[PDB]
Write a protein that binds this ligand. Structure first.
Ligand SMILES: [Mg+2]
Length: 122
RNA sequence: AAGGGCACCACCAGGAGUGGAGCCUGCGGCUUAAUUUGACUCAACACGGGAAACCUCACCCGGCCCGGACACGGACAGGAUU
């Protein structure tokens, strides 16, 4: 399970240092409605059902992959949406709830989401 | 006070004048919301290279903008904000 979660860690890291990936609900909607977006990542600890039924029901009608992570806070720490000093707060913000990767930057570690799509089609 | 010398920003011998008139322009005063301000014997007053319609622009009457770095807290991708 390390070789998939750390894998999309590296994927979103190279995506955000190479370009801008959409962070937050409005940019996520406006980025995946356009027909270039790669997989979405969204949290599991959401407290309201219309938010989650919106995001899954609106990504499933597209042809885009989905990976679900348990907490939004630690995800937001992962997605670079913070002011991380190496001796202070890891995540001083309420973390992000859903992102979408517009571009990977390069094809170094695309095999992880390739086999992710394989087991999704399994 | 005396004794030497000197200068048309002194005089003499004169020339052209200015002071008088209309106008231009600079100062004071008066008036004004404001009539921005400096300079007042030579050594201020067509001077600030100052002939301002706007800008200049300081002054008056109104109305936008931040072009308030940075540091520390706060709030923040369920949205700081434009
Ligand atoms: Mg004389």
């Amino acid at each position: 399970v390390m070789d998939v979660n750390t894998a999309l860690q590296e994927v979103l890291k190279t995506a955000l240092i190479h370009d801008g990936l959409a962070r937050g609900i409005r940019e996520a909607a406006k980025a995946l409605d356009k027909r270039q977006a790669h997989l979405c990542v969204q949290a599991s600890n959401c407290d309201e059902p219309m938010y989650v039924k919106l995001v899954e029901a609106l990504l499933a009608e597209h042809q885009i992959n989905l990976i679900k992570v348990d907490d939004n806070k630690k995800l937001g720490e992962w997605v670079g949406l913070c002011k991380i000093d190496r001796e202070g707060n890891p995540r001083k913000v309420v973390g992000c709830s859903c992102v979408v990767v517009k571009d990977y930057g390069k094809e170094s570690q695309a095999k992880d989401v390739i086999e992710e799509y394989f087991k999704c089609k399994k």
